[PDB]
Amino acid sequence: SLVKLANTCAHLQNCSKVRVALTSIPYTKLQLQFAYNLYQQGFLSSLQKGSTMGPDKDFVEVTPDNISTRRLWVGLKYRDNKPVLSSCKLISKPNSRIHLPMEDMKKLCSGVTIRNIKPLQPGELILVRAHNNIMDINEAISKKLDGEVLCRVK
Amino acid sequence: ATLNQIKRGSGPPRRKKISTAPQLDQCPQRKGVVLRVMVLKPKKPNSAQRKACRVRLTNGNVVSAYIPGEGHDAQEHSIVYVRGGRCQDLPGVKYHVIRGAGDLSGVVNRISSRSKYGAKKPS
Amino acid sequence: KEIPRYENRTIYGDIDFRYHGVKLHLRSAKPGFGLRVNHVIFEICECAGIKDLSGKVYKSRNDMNIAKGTIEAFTKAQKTLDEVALGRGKKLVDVRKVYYSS
Amino acid sequence: FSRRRIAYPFYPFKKLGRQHPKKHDTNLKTAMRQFLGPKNYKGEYVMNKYFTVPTNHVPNYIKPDLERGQSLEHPVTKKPLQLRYDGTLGPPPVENKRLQNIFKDRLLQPFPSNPHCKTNYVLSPQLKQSIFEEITVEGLSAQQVSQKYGLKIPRVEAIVKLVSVENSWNRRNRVSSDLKTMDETLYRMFPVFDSDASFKRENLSEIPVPQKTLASRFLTIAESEPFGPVDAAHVLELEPAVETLRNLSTVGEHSSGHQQSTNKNTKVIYGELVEGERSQYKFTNAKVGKVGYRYGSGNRDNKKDRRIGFNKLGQMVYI
RNA sequence: AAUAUGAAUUAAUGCGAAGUUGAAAUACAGUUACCGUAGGGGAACCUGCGGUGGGCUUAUAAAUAUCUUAAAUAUUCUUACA
RNA sequence: AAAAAUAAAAUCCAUAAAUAAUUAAAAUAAUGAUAUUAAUUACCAUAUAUUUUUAUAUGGAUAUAUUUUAAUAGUCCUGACUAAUAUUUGUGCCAGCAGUCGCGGUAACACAAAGAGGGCGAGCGUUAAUCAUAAUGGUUUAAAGGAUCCGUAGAAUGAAUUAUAUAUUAUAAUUUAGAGUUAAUAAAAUUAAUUAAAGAAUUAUAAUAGUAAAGAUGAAAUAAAUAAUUAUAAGACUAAUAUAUGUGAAAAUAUUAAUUAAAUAUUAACUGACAUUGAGGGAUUAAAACUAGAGUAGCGAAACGGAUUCGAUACCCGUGUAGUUCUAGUAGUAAACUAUGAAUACAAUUAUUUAUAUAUAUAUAUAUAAAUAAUAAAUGAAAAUGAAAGUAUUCCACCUGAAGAGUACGUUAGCAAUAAUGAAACUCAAAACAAUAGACGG
RNA sequence: UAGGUAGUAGGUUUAUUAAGAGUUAAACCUAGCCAACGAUCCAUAAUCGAUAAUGAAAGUUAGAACGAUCACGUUGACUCUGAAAUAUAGUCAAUAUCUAUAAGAUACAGCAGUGAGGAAUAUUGGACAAUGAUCGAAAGAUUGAUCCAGUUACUUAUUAGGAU
Numbered sequence A: 001s002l003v004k005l006a007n008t009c010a011h012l013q014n015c016s017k018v019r020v021a022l023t024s025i026p027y028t029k030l031q032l033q034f035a036y037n038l039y040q041q042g043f044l045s046s047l048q049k050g051s052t053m054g055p056d057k058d059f060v061e062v063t064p065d066n067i068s069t070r071r072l073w074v075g076l077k078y079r080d081n082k083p084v085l086s087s088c089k090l091i092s093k094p095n096s097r098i099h100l101p102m103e104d105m106k107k108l109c110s111g112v113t114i115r116n117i118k119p120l121q122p123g124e125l126i127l128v129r130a131h132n133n134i135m136d137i138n139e140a141i142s143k144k145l146d147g148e149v150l151c152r153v154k
Numbered sequence B: 001a002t003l004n005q006i007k008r009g010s011g012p013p014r015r016k017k018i019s020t021a022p023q024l025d026q027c028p029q030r031k032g033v034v035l036r037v038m039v040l041k042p043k044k045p046n047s048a049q050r051k052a053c054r055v056r057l058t059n060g061n062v063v064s065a066y067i068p069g070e071g072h073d074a075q076e077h078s079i080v081y082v083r084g085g086r087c088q089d090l091p092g093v094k095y096h097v098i099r100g101a102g103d104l105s106g107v108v109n110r111i112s113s114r115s116k117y118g119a120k121k122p123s
Numbered sequence C: 001k002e003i004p005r006y007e008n009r010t011i012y013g014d015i016d017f018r019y020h021g022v023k024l025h026l027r028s029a030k031p032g033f034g035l036r037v038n039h040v041i042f043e044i045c046e047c048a049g050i051k052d053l054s055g056k057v058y059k060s061r062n063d064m065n066i067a068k069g070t071i072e073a074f075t076k077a078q079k080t081l082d083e084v085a086l087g088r089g090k091k092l093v094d095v096r097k098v099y100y101s102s
Numbered sequence D: 001f002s003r004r005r006i007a008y009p010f011y012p013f014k015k016l017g018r019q020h021p022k023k024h025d026t027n028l029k030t031a032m033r034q035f036l037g038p039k040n041y042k043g044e045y046v047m048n049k050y051f052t053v054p055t056n057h058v059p060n061y062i063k064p065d066l067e068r069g070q071s072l073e074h075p076v077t078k079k080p081l082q083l084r085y086d087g088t089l090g091p092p093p094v095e096n097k098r099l100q101n102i103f104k105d106r107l108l109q110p111f112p113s114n115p116h117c118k119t120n121y122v123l124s125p126q127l128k129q130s131i132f133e134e135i136t137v138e139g140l141s142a143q144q145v146s147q148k149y150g151l152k153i154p155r156v157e158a159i160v161k162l163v164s165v166e167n168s169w170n171r172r173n174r175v176s177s178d179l180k181t182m183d184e185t186l187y188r189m190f191p192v193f194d195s196d197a198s199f200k201r202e203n204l205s206e207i208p209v210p211q212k213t214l215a216s217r218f219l220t221i222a223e224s225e226p227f228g229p230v231d232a233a234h235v236l237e238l239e240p241a242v243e244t245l246r247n248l249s250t251v252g253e254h255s256s257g258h259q260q261s262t263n264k265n266t267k268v269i270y271g272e273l274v275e276g277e278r279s280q281y282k283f284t285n286a287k288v289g290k291v292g293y294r295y296g297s298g299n300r301d302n303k304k305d306r307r308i309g310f311n312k313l314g315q316m317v318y319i
Numbered sequence E: 001a002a003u004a005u006g007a008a009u010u011a012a013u014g015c016g017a018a019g020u021u022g023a024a025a026u027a028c029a030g031u032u033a034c035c036g037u038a039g040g041g042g043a044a045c046c047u048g049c050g051g052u053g054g055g056c057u058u059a060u061a062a063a064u065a066u067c068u069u070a071a072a073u074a075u076u077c078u079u080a081c082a
Numbered sequence F: 001a002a003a004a005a006u007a008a009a010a011u012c013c014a015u016a017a018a019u020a021a022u023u024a025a026a027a028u029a030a031u032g033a034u035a036u037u038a039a040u041u042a043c044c045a046u047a048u049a050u051u052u053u054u055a056u057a058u059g060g061a062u063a064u065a066u067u068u069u070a071a072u073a074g075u076c077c078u079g080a081c082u083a084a085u086a087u088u089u090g091u092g093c094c095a096g097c098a099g100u101c102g103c104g105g106u107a108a109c110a111c112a113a114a115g116a117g118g119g120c121g122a123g124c125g126u127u128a129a130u131c132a133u134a135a136u137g138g139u140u141u142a143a144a145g146g147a148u149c150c151g152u153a154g155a156a157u158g159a160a161u162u163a164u165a166u167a168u169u170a171u172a173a174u175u176u177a178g179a180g181u182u183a184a185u186a187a188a189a190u191u192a193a194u195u196a197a198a199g200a201a202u203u204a205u206a207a208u209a210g211u212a213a214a215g216a217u218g219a220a221a222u223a224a225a226u227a228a229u230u231a232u233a234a235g236a237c238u239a240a241u242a243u244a245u246g247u248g249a250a251a252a253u254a255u256u257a258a259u260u261a262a263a264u265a266u267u268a269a270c271u272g273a274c275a276u277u278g279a280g281g282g283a284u285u286a287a288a289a290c291u292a293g294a295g296u297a298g299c300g301a302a303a304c305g306g307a308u309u310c311g312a313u314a315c316c317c318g319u320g321u322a323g324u325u326c327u328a329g330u331a332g333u334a335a336a337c338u339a340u341g342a343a344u345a346c347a348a349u350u351a352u353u354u355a356u357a358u359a360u361a362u363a364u365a366u367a368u369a370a371a372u373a374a375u376a377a378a379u380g381a382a383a384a385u386g387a388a389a390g391u392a393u394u395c396c397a398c399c400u401g402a403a404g405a406g407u408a409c410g411u412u413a414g415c416a417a418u419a420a421u422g423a424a425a426c427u428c429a430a431a432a433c434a435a436u437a438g439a440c441g442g
Numbered sequence G: 001u002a003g004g005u006a007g008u009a010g011g012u013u014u015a016u017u018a019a020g021a022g023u024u025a026a027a028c029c030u031a032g033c034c035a036a037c038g039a040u041c042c043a044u045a046a047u048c049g050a051u052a053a054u055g056a057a058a059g060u061u062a063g064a065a066c067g068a069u070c071a072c073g074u075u076g077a078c079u080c081u082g083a084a085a086u087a088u089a090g091u092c093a094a095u096a097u098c099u100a101u102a103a104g105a106u107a108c109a110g111c112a113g114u115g116a117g118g119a120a121u122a123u124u125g126g127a128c129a130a131u132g133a134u135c136g137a138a139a140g141a142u143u144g145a146u147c148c149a150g151u152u153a154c155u156u157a158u159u160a161g162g163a164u
């Protein structure tokens, strides 16, 4: 769901403004892939599976009995009195989805505004979804993949 | 507006200057015949005896044109050429007559800006 | 105040900053691009040492609030490559600069 | 705020006082006569320090800021002379310290307000012959002579071309005394090039700056990932910069690597020539869809950007 | 039947200058104003009915207070005592 | 530092044109309209050397030299926007200028000129036009949230897992977090419609004794009483509680009872995305008004009188008709307001109530929600908003300077009043909001 | 402009055509078809480009010039020939003019030119030398296509004197 992803993007911005060290997001494949990309890129300190009440200390298998109570817990980073994850916005919106070929993704990473999408800025992360997998735009260009431009994180 | 409202027509209004000489019919100038020469009083805070003239254009539109320059020889039945441009202090006078065209002579003894007053170059 | 400058000529990336009623959209520019911005922003860039910059002002174009907004944007809306790298634990490479390196 | 401003000298000068009614002089004209000094019966300005050319390979460029408008000196002793109350020229009261230790860069800077403009070094008549004899007789490559004397390859190729023109002129006695006099005078006005002097040597690593690369792309990679010039070149989809420099050094007509044969693959026919025919037909194979004048092409003749060229005879022709 | 033109005839409104008759609004504007509606009157306006605050949140006391070693002891103390 | 001005003349050296010779190319088998061709050469031809080019020397050709020879730009502008500092004269709100702001009433940087100056330039100016010049927007208070909700279309949007496919979509299976169904347990007595009752007072009438004034107002005057104690009749209204708290989609809703309908929390089970929003459409909708039939105490447009007043078609007083009431309808408008559409996810505190649950050393304590108040952050033109007017997402309505105008015309609906829909021309460079310091206030 | 449509929507059959189809004509059935994502109606307009203008761009504007396409040759309809024409043909009619007064000829939106209209747009020029086109076996003939020149600062470009 792009709506759920929009909710998570706004939630992370709200948490950064108040500078909470730990927060939770919905437990879904897309959310987990989204969070994992942020973790590998250094935007998130930690990524743990858990419940509504907090991160799990020991592995708890997820089943239909507890799926409704599952959450993903992420740790936010702050350095030099500044949040590492300052902004998080969707590019492809629920009511206007944007699919780009690899050629247009290369233009976006080169400073060209494609379909009103402002080009990639220094130190910014743009994520792309292709065949239900989320990857960095630079990685999609390396794999010659065409996909939906989901969001941009800075 | 929402994305669907924009799809249905919603959008920013367009900015483009509007015509201030509708009676000319998108022509640089139109010939006319002076119906009656008149003197009008500027709107406040201006005071003067501004010379104007009612003119019937070759397209049937009747307009009020300001006669520029010091002194004019325009009379009734005189053939005049009317161009765009309003007299700011005279409401309803939206046009100018061209000096030195038709039966309206150039300003007598004009030295500066002669081209604007139909004055030929002194030898 | 000190303002970060990328290569001591321009800003780091693009800036969309709102100072009261003034909407400032500043974009970084290539070397030799010059200053193509509001006249108020031009003077500030000259004193600050910014040589290449593009941008547009939207909504309010009040000179006083443009100057203050610009100064605030140059400090609160910029992040150096070094600061981004340290916060994220990643290496950020300027491809254009590496292309002309040994 | 702006107003018209007469270009009065920035330095102090003796303004006009009470003037006889028929002089009709100006403060600008009197300031110029003070800069120029007295004019002799021969129409010369001997007292001005710029009237005569230097003869020591050191350019005599104007330094108004450092001398504060004092341009007069003794024509033989080169000792400063300034205007006094009597209306005569005499030694200055205090020496000018700004004119005794001038930076080396400033000496080569002709315009006071532009320090990015410098004069070039003149090559001695000997270095030119050496370069000419090495490229032509010894058969060295322009790349070698360029890397040896610290001269850019285009300059090396130009020296060979020009020295060849000087040999034909000297072989036909076309270099007159006046030309020799002028050449020597101009030679003694410029700093001579010294191949050994490191600072005088021209940079040999310059490449044209492309436009696609002029943008600033940034990549976020792992903290310990190596990224080098070759990796950057792949990202920008350009040949490595070192390769560009090497390809630009093999362009000289006498440089190594100069090659042009991949184009000799276009079928050409030279029509038969019969006695009495004033011209020969040459046919060049082409491909339908590329050859021909296109239909409906933009006419630019009535536009400011109308294309203007020059034919083989040098006559201006519309393209 | 439509379109266009002129048209007897007839309705609404803008601006321009000063005057005339009142003083309706802005302060508690001298009867709180305004909204919907109805009736009445030279003119603004007046009156009835409900609604609104873009008017009253502008809001500010019937007061009453207690016992343990006043010092040879607390109050001093300068890295000390322990 | 007031220049005009290296400007002029003059000096040096050129080229164009002319003159002379020569002469391509468009076209060749030949044909050239253009054409008095372009170009080249400067006595012509020739030889040699000679990037080019140059140079020498030769044949003929004139008197040691060899055809001639120049250089007259206009137009707008100089108060600011907007480049134009060297001043001066005339005019005096006249004459006139003007793209915008404006200039002109005797020191006019703006009019008409001189001087000087700034542009563009064989064009310059001006008019008529085109493109660009802010939606990288808004709707509490400035233009702009529909009275409200229900719900159709939506070529609108919308959960989870897995597997395929031709892939952000489809299909299949599976799942329960959204949305619902039914019970159980506890809680509450409101909101609609209908029926049946109660209450204080008012007016009128009659009686009774008892009198001579009463009533009204700022003060007045107009129209066996007033007051008191009884009895009868009628219509309308609903004191305290009470906070409209709460409830209801809004409009609305507070004397009592009953009948019917709907409405809360948690738990258990069940369905398995069945949801959100909603053009058109539909329903409901204060007060006034209207159509019929009743009712009519009090109140009260109008009307007629009394006062007040310079006047009083008002404010105050009297008599008081419609109306206000009920029954059945029409109509669908309000400052129908929180001047703030609905839904979802999310973000830092305190206080105060309410509800549910838990515990006990039994009355507090501990939890989780809702409401309200004051706030942090954020937002904003600010006033302020504060869980939204914050961070985001989805859908709908609406706005594009003022005035003209919610007007004109047409159409639709209505018994009618009217309601809905809804312009343009002309004119202007205004118009509006928040806040600041004043001044003023019967 | 809110309802429109009645060969109208669909089915079947024949005629007609090289050829499908309510495309036309004939017959018989079904009750459909379009429409608030704008039907029907009315007004306006030749369309477009690798053309021109403008802008950072998306776009917007023009549709003169170059090129592509359509329509028309005073107006309407019809017919003939033909692969193809409601032909700048023929027929009839309409409007206007003309002379030869005939069931007549002409219609400059071919070139030049004139009057009119308008603020405003040119020579009643030269040549078939070139490139094409038509006729002819060829020789050649014809060509206001075309190529040139004239008029006009309408646009562009170059030049319109340098040193002292």
Ligand SMILES: [K+]
Pocket (backbone or CB within 6 Å): none
């Ligand atoms: K009033």
Ligand SMILES: [K+]
Pocket (backbone or CB within 6 Å): none
């Ligand atoms: K009212």
Ligand SMILES: [K+]
Pocket (backbone or CB within 6 Å): none
């Ligand atoms: K009223």
Ligand SMILES: [K+]
Pocket (backbone or CB within 6 Å): none
């Ligand atoms: K000039």
Ligand SMILES: [K+]
Pocket (backbone or CB within 6 Å): none
């Ligand atoms: K607002």
Ligand SMILES: [K+]
Pocket (backbone or CB within 6 Å): F244
């Ligand atoms: K309430």
Ligand SMILES: [K+]
Pocket (backbone or CB within 6 Å): none
């Ligand atoms: K399912």
Ligand SMILES: [K+]
Pocket (backbone or CB within 6 Å): none
């Ligand atoms: K729906």
Ligand SMILES: [K+]
Pocket (backbone or CB within 6 Å): none
């Ligand atoms: K609706």
Ligand SMILES: [K+]
Pocket (backbone or CB within 6 Å): F296
């Ligand atoms: K009554």
Ligand SMILES: [K+]
Pocket (backbone or CB within 6 Å): F341, F342, F396, F397
């Ligand atoms: K809505």
Ligand SMILES: [K+]
Pocket (backbone or CB within 6 Å): G038
């Ligand atoms: K239509």
Ligand SMILES: [K+]
Pocket (backbone or CB within 6 Å): G128
């Ligand atoms: K021909």
Ligand SMILES: [Mg+2]
Pocket (backbone or CB within 6 Å): D002
């Ligand atoms: Mg200026």
Ligand SMILES: [Mg+2]
Pocket (backbone or CB within 6 Å): none
């Ligand atoms: Mg009054």
Ligand SMILES: [Mg+2]
Pocket (backbone or CB within 6 Å): E024, E029
């Ligand atoms: Mg009043």
